[model samples]
Target chain A: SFFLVKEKMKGKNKLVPRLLGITKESVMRVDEKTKEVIQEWSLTNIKRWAASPKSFTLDFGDYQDGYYSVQTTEGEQIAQLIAGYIDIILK
Target chain B: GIDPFTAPGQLECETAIAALNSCLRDLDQASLAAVSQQLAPREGISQEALHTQMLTAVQEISHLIEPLASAARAEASQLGHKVSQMAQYFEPLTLAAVGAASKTLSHPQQMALLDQTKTLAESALQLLYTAKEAGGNPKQAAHTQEALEEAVQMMTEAVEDLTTTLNEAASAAG
Candidate 1:
């Protein structure tokens, strides 16, 4: 995970730098500078996700408060990684 | 799956078209797996997983179609060409889903729903080809534009039916 912009405040942008953290079984959003976990979602809990070159959307369905997305240059990689982990778990 | 929002330069190439076909092929597989889930419900793999898997397929197609629909409303060119190809990709995917769920789709409503879906889609593409071939004269283009809106509605219904058909399997599988 690296520095990225992921704030959607009133459709304008801001300085909240964030990144994604991955585990063998889950993925979470983390504060880039503080190194603190903002929210974590278990891999098994992910219901769906969408990936594009500029962003990735993570949906937890009813398993969590809803969902969050991360916008990054590395969006595709992050999406593939998460899909891979979920696939492994489903097996 | 492709989102219309991409580098203008990134489109109009083999890769853009290529990537979607490649990705949807996998999604189509995931779709069939979900369809098959209803035919022979498995142990350990919860209903939620199959539900999500099929939703992913429906979601992928819906996402891809939304942009094209938007483009059509804007009177965008080649909506016919693009949807035609995407429809071709969609065909096999539909067949496999139907094949998998044929045993479990007990109701004629379920059967007819998918039938009407394909029939309308076929007519839309046929109308598109008519508009494409007869020429793009101003008067013709205007009428073609008018028909497109109507056709898009039908196409939308078709997709909703597809989404509905897939969802029914999940709902009925229990």
Candidate 2:
């Protein structure tokens, strides 16, 4: 079960990206089999000001289909901003 | 072990819980009073007796709480600690944040922020009972709700208010 957790990333997580204001591009790609999120993809050109892992739990209970959910304006704002930046990297 | 005498003990425990919760409410109010300008004009809050009073209250209720599942006792225990910690954290945070905020915004505005945080924490505390009654994720949900409330009330509120003041100062300086 791959899980992506982000709130305020710091300490060991930020050994590489520290000084720059939180950009919009910190992306985490989850590998289901390994149950780990691979980082380094940009969600936005800017890194997030705050990020946290180990707090929010995303449970994957025997689901093989694509996820479905709509985003709130605030949610969209954050997602669009970050993924927009990361899309460039992925492309 | 349901027993013939269980009712009396349970009653006692319930009484204790109520008293304990009341003390918590008072302690909360006292802590709030320390920073709030909106208190009901009182004095002589004995600092030394509060700990024992609160302890006694919880201990009295401990028997009744024990019959509950492991989750309830754990949550009650956490509630006691978090309530105290919330009180303690708000004290210094409020003092510093209020001073910093007061430099720019009026005292009323600062108090409004304080009231908002206090209400938020109280509202979250109320939800604990809700989670318990609902037989849902009582421990996690209640704690999470309270934590979110406390973070906003005791921690983030101060920070946010401070940020506002900082911005105001920056604007004035620039």
Candidate 3:
């Protein structure tokens, strides 16, 4: 629903503003300005997620494409929301 | 870094590996610095700060003694053993922290305070020994139960010295 910064931890560390979308179906990454969904991954594909004060990390288990972290003040809130959705999906 | 023409993710993926190599070099240096810093003497800690640090560490064990004494007063050895075990846990970490703070010890008052803290803590530990012995040989456990309780009282004077000094130091600065 809002913009967040995606943090790259490897190979030229950088922070880029990006938009995140969470619906009943998928977690999608959208271009900030153009509104084009750049990438989409099914919630079931998410293997693990952890939140600290600084970052929310999602591990999908791919070597290159597996790791994603979003730098946000709401890391804990985002983590709980994702967990809630995952639990509902499972139920 | 913003490019509207192409999807920025494509550019990021292409440039990523070079950043990774540089990041590795920095990471290695950071690890080395952490090891060396712990080995070398800590810099910038003043006498008052060191005093505060020492007292803070002593306070952890002091507070433990206070409660252990209370437990002993009531015909006890169950909580006694449990507490002794907890003290054992605190002993190493607390002693090391207290020792590190006093490693830079100076000021005559600090020396006196440190000496008393050490002596009281020694009594605390010795009494802990006797108290635990009562656990193994409960024949007169009630008698030795006092050791654990008395161990708690041993630090009363030690704590008073620390608290009064802590206040004096803070006020003396003002």
Listed for each candidate, the true contacts retained, as a fraction, are 0.00, 0.00, 0.00
Task: Extract clashing residue pairs from model 1.
Answer: none
| lDDT by residue (tens digit), candidate 1, A1-91 | 4446464322212224566667786666777678788767677767655443444445565557422444456755776776677677678
lDDT of 1 at B39: 35
Candidate 3 regions with alpha-carbon error over 4 angstroms: A1-91, B1-48, B72-106, B136-139, B146-149, B171-174
Q: Which one is best on lDDT?
A: 3
DockQ-derived CAPRI band for the predicted complex in model 3: incorrect
TM-score of the A chain in candidate 3?
0.76
Candidate 2 local distance difference test against the native: 0.32
lDDT of 1 by residue, B1-174 (tens): 222332221133233345434433443343334333433433334443544554565455556555555444342354444444555545444444344334334433333333333333343343333233222233434666665555555555556545554566565543
- Which pairs in model 3 have colliding backbones? A11-B16, A11-B20, A12-B19
Relative to the true structure, candidate 2 reaches a TM of: 0.24
- Per-prediction DockQ, in order? 0.01, 0.02, 0.01
lDDT of 2 by residue, B1-174 (tens): 121221222232333334444434543454334434444422322222322232233333333232333332244434433333333433333333333322323222333333333332333333233323322233434555454333223333223333342333333312
lDDT of 3 by residue, B64-160 (tens): 6655554444324343443544344333323332433344332223323333343344444444444443433445566676555555554464456
Sorting all predicted structures by DockQ, with the top scorer first, yields 2, 1, 3
The runs of at least 3 residues in candidate 1 whose Cα sits more than 4 Å from the true structure, single-residue gaps closed, are A1-91, B1-58, B69-81, B105-110, B130-139
User: Residue B12 in model 2: shift from native, Å?
Assistant: 15
